[PDB]
Design a protein around this ligand. Sequence first.
Ligand code: 26U
Ligand code: NA
Ligand code: NA
Lengths: 28, 251, 10
Amino acid sequence: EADCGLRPLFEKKSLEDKTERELLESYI
Amino acid sequence: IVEGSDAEIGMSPWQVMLFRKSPQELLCGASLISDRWVLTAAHCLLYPPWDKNFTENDLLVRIGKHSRTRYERNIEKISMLEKIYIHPRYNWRENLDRDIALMKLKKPVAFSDYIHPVCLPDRETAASLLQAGYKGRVTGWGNLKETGQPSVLQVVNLPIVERPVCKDSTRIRITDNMFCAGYKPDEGKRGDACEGDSGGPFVMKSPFNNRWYQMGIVSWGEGCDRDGKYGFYTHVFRLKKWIQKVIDQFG
Amino acid sequence: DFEEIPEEYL
Ligand SMILES: CC(C)CCC(=O)N1CCC[C@H]1C(=O)NCc1ccc(C(=N)N)cc1
Ligand code: NA
Ligand code: NA
């Protein structure tokens, strides 16, 4: 699907969840 | 999920609960990958050592949920199965190699704030993200400990482990269709999937396009959150050929 | 321990 992986209550509103940054910081 | 936290509302809108018709109970986790297809672990449906063999009509899929036990009116959707597809080379006799199954819903589910599909990885995303030390996220309503059920969906972030450490942690024969994740005893932090989390997703958020991808399926583990042991996950990308075939030739 | 689901889902 076109829209997969984009959560309505987070990415679609440019809101981050409380721990997604932990994942990003591990992607070195 | 051991040593996790309560999920936020809408944090995992691809999370699916596999639910028994009678007696009514959780059987497993699962994930939504389009408006009519759900991904889970083969052992959720077929596991002869435990006399487990479920058919379409034994089961329902519940989507959009947060609460484990509650019927979440106006929010969850409950869907019937049209057909179950298990990997033809799923190895239930030895080590759960190719622990993967697809379920086709009787009718499409309506997407919503709480219901939305996850992406499946292409080769380049898989190559970039499936690296030792990179963290993914696992969700489920399974046990909080190996002896204890949560009120709501739980979440835990865990680092992928290098293949030699995975192998040296167990006597089971590990294959290329699996990966393991979890903290080492030396690392401090902990957490793990557990019974009832089976078939649920291990996801990563791609830093290239900011989409969530399902890289693994909760498959097996020896105890839960034991020092020196790691949870094992079906490697979704490795089995993509089969997934595509099934959806292409049955959708 | 599970809230009963609406009868129509069987
Ligand atoms: C044969 C197999 C390699 C070991 C037993 C095993 O784990 N089983 C045999 C049948 C299904 C699976 C299971 O119990 N999965 C549930 C489970 C257990 C532990 C964890 C974990 N990450 N600790 C996750 C899922
Ligand atoms: Na070993
Ligand atoms: Na461990």
